[PDB]
Design a protein around this ligand. Structure first.
Ligand SMILES: COc1ccc(OC)c(-c2ccc(-c3cn(CCc4ccc(C(=O)N(C)C)cc4)nn3)cn2)c1
Length: 276
C-alpha cells in the first residue's frame, strides 16, 4: 500500500487495464487528498500517489521519473497534481518528454504562479522574516532584532533551522511532530519559488480556481494577484483552462472536485478509446 514514496490509491489490474493516474503530494500533505478526485474518475481507474522526497523541484523529479518509467514504461502517462503537486507533475512531464516518453495528460489543479516573481535576495529574506516575526509576536510571546546577517546567507532550510534553533535556545520546546508538519509545509511550498519551469510540448489542463485563500497570501503576499492563465501560457502552447471557481484550498475537495473529475474523466475516456 505504501512502497517507498509510492502510495497505491487504487492498484492497477495484474495485467492490462486502464491507464493509471499518477498524483503528486501537496506541501504539508499526503496523496490521500486525491481520494475525492478518485471517486469522481471512471471505475477501475488505477491511481498511484508520489509522496515527499528531498531537494529542489528538479531534484525531486529526478527521483520520481525513474520510478514512473519502472511502473508505466513507454506510457501513456497521465500526471495530476494540486498545489505543489501540480508543479511536481509538470516537472515530471518535462523529464519524461526528454526521455521520449508518451505524456498524454497533465492536470494542474490550481497550481498557479505568484502574480510577481519572488526575489532571491537578502532584502527579500529580511522582509519576509520581519513579517513572520511580527505575526509570531501576537503568537507565543518582543522578538529580539532578527540576526539578518546569518539569516540572509542561508537557503530556506537553513533559515528555518536557524529560527527553530533560536526558539529552542530561548526556552520554547516544540513537539517534533508540530515542527515536522510546519517545517515541511513551509519548505515544500518555498521550493516552488525557484522552480526551473521549462516549455512543454503536450496537452495541459489547468483547473483554475478564482483566487488563493488568505493563508497562502499571508505565507507569500504575491499570491494575492494571479493571471487568467496562472502563468502557464508562455510555457504551454497547448493549454486548456477549466474554470472551477472558489479558493485554492477548496479545489481538491467536494463539491468542486466533481467539476475537475467530470472533465478529467472525459480526457481519460478519450485516451482509453485511442488505445485501440
Ligand atoms: C518560479 O518559476 C515559476 C514559473 C512558472 C510557474 O507557473 C506557471 C511557477 C509556479 C507554478 C505553480 C505555483 C504554485 C504554488 N502553489 C501553492 C502555493 C501555496 C499553497 C498553500 C499555502 C498555505 O496555505 N500555507 C499555509 C503555506 C501556501 C502556498 N501551487 N502552485 C507557483 N509558481 C513558477
Amino acid at each position: 500500500q505504501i512502497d517507498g514514496f509510492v502510495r497505491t490509491l487504487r492498484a492497477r489490474p495484474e495485467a492490462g487495464g486502464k491507464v493509471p493516474v499518477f498524483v503528486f503530494h501537496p506541501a504539508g500533505g499526503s496523496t490521500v487528498v486525491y481520494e475525492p478526485l478518485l471517486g469522481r474518475l471512471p471505475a477501475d481507474t488505477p491511481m498511484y500517489g508520489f509522496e515527499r522526497v528531498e531537494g529542489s523541484i528538479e531534484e525531486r523529479a529526478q527521483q520520481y521519473v525513474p520510478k514512473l518509467i519502472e511502473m508505466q514504461g513507454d506510457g501513456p502517462y497521465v500526471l495530476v497534481g494540486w498545489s505543489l503537486g501540480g508543479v511536481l507533475a509538470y516537472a515530471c512531464a518535462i523529464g519524461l518528454r526528454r526521455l521520449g516518453k508518451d505524456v498524454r495528460f497533465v492536470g494542474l489543479i490550481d497550481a498557479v504562479r505568484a502574480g510577481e516573481e519572488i526575489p532571491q535576495t537578502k532584502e527579500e529574506i529580511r522582509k519576509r522574516w520581519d513579517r513572520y516575526a511580527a505575526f509570531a509576536e501576537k503568537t507565543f510571546n518582543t522578538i529580539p532584532a532578527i540576526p539578518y546577517e546569518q539569516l540572509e546567507e542561508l537557503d530556506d532550510e537553513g533559515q528555518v533551522r536557524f529560527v527553530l534553533d533560536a526558539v529552542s535556545q530561548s526556552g520554547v520546546q516544540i513537539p517534533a511532530g508540530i515542527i515536522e508538519h510546519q517545517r515541511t509545509s513551509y519548505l515544500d511550498n518555498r521550493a516552488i519559488d525557484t522552480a526551473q519551469i521549462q516549455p512543454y510540448d503536450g496537452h495541459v489542463t489547468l483547473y483554475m480556481a478564482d483566487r488563493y485563500h488568505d493563508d497562502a497570501i499571508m505565507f507569500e503576499p504575491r499570491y494575492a494577484v494571479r493571471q487568467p492563465d496562472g502563468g502557464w501560457g508562455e510555457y504551454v502552447s497547448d493549454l486548456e483552462v477549466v474554470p472551477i471557481g472558489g479558493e485554492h484550498i477548496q479545489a481538491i475537495d467536494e463539491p468542486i472536485i466533481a467539476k475537475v473529475g467530470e472533465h478529467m474523466s472525459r480526457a481519460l475516456g478519450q485516451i482509453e478509446a485511442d488505445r485501440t
